[PDB]
């Protein structure tokens, strides 16, 4: 795989940075992120998928709207549910609402879901390099909040699946002076960090990058 | 310990306490009450674009309240905000999303 990768550079494959606010919807933002990118990569159509759909309906795939969830499961929702609409037709509100899914309005599809084994970082490295941006979760400690630039390393987090707490989109990988990193899309608005983005150290399964990550194969 | 969920319950800390003291005027601007001392008893954290504290505050002989504060992200200039509050809570009522 190349020393570096970056879907943004490759093209109109990554959507604008989104803001998720005070709702625990960060998982839905990984999911919509991946899929959008997949579709674009596969077709050239850059779409902005609705996270409220996932906030209001994923319930069955073990998610819990604003109080949490995982992208793999979100992907399954999109598959079984048979599609997911985009923002303009199901506006993002940040709170728990009751499902307003409308079948003739879904604009994006999930055929299958690629699950990167537990703690297998290089598989993420492969996927992100060869197929798509990978949705992922990791422990976020207070340090992380201040984040502004550079490569976020942590000796505070512990790479265990007992406390990862934030889903994000791996949109690339790369290298800085000698330390390897991940180019990551966050869901806190463009103002935070490097215009919505952050760079975590690669190679140590830092905070659990590789704990429960995935990417989706779009039905296109 | 899912993504976007709430942490396990942890005992309250001096920072949490402070949060409840900075926030107590808000609980009041809304309930129009006048509480005595509100003691931070326990809490839970949730990661949003910022933090959402779920504070179990002991205030009244054996009267507990559950406040929910959203702490902004270091970025812009903003204080703590009382975005919710359950009242008539017990000493054991588990803190939860709301």
């Amino acid at each position: 795989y190349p020393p570096s990768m970056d879907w943004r550079k490759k093209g109109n494959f990554v959507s604008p940075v989104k803001n998720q606010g005070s709702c625990g919807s960060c998982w839905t933002f990984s999911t919509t992120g991946a899929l959008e990118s997949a579709v674009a990569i596969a077709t050239g159509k850059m779409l902005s998928l609705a996270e409220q759909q996932l906030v209001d309906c994923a319930q069955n795939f073990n998610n819990h709207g604003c109080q949490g969830g995982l992208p793999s499961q979100a992907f399954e929702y999109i598959r079984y549910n048979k599609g997911i609409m985009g923002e303009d037709t199901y506006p993002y509100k940040g709170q728990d609402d009751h499902c307003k899914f409308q079948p003739d309005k879904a604009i994006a599809f999930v055929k299958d879901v690629a699950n990167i084994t537990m703690n297998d970082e290089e598989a993420m490295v492969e996927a992100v390099a060869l197929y798509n941006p990978v949705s992922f979760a990791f422990e976020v400690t207070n340090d992380f909040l201040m984040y502004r630039k550079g490569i976020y390393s942590s000796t505070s987090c512990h790479k265990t699946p007992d406390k990862v707490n934030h889903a994000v989109l791996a949109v690339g990988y790369g290298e800085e002076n000698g330390i390897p990193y991940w180019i990551v899309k966050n869901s806190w608005g463009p103002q935070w960090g490097m215009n919505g983005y952050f760079l975590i150290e690669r190679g140590k399964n830092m905070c659990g990058l590789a704990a429960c990550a995935s990417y989706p194969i779009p039905l296109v | 310990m899912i993504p976007g969920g709430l942490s396990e319950a942890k005992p309250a800390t001096p920072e949490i306490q402070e949060i409840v003291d900075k926030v107590k005027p808000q609980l009041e601007e809304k309930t129009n009450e006048t509480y005595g001392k509100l003691e931070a008893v326990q809490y839970k954290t949730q990661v949003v674009a910022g933090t959402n504290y779920y504070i179990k505050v002991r205030a009244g002989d054996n009267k507990y309240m559950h406040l929910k504060v959203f702490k902004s992200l270091p970025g812009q200039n903003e204080d703590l905000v009382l975005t919710g509050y359950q009242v008539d809570k017990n000493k054991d009522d588990e803190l939860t999303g709301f």
Binding site: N63, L70, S72, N115, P161, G208 | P3
Partner: peptide, 8 residues
């Protein structure tokens, strides 16, 4: 196997 992390 289902992704254990966002489960319980």
């Amino acid at each position: 196997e289902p992704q254990n992390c966002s489960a319980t």
